[PDB]
């Protein structure tokens with residue numbers, strides 16, 4: 001909402017259209033380590049956030065941040081490499097501006113990915129978790145991307161989030177994981193957003209556990225929210241880049257400056273999976 005005016009999203013949308021002969025259908029937001037999806041595209045046309053009209057520029061991780069328009073597995077994409085984060089100082093209305101613009105680009109689906117810690121013991125690092133739901137902690141406190149005057153032009157005042165993670169795409173994804181014959185069934189669970197750049201303490205992991213979160217991370221929830229607000233089909237996965245220590249026999253460390261699951265091929269499986277899934281994302285054509 002706030003900070004930008006509808007014409008900002010307009011201007012930015014039209015500029016992007018008047019600058020890429022591409023017209024996307026699926027918008028993909030790559031989390032840390034899953035930036036590689038950008039190589040799978042063809043017809044790729046790269047834009048640095050910086051150069052696009054009202055697009056939040058990166059603060060430091062620019063060296064991982066640009067918008068790549070291409071084609072992935074028979075689907076016109078618009079990939080966002082290096083998403084924005086609240087912990088980077090971005091107000092949420094900047095963190096989600098891209099989703100808003102995507103929609104105006106004709107985008108009707110958003111697949112959000114991210115790297116998260118494994119709250120659920122079942123999770124093995126490297127596990128890919130289909131996001132079934134989310135606990136939007138900063139949202140409970142007011143840090144919700146929709147705070148401010150609602151633009152009935154993008155959507156309602158009180159969007160329903162109960163149905164955020166497209167049930168359809170989740171069934172398809174669980175199937176496709178199977179069709180691929182991967183063995184380890186695509187994990188699935190609730191994702192809990194938590195801001196602040198620092199990592200959870202043991203006692204905090206336990207509340208995230210209690211609350212019912214399966215994987216903890218610092219992004220995605222606001223994009224899922226302004227996406228649904230616009231009526232974008234949304235589904236996503238989180239790459240369990242590590243397991244959070246629930247007991248005080250902590251020791252073990254797993255910074256971004258580590259990120260080794262995503263600092264490895266675990267992330268590669270997610271990229272290909274997401275690529276395969278382009279084939280299960282309904283076309284705007286429908287065509288019977």
Ligand SMILES: C[n+]1cn([C@@H]2O[C@H](CO)[C@@H](O)[C@H]2O)c2nc(N)nc([S-])c21
Nearest residue numbers: 032115116117216217218241242255256
């Ligand atoms: C697994 N680990 C990775 N992230 C996310 O990846 C980027 C770098 O860590 C960061 O942007 C971050 O979102 C994690 N996030 C949380 N809340 N907890 C853990 S244990 C965690």
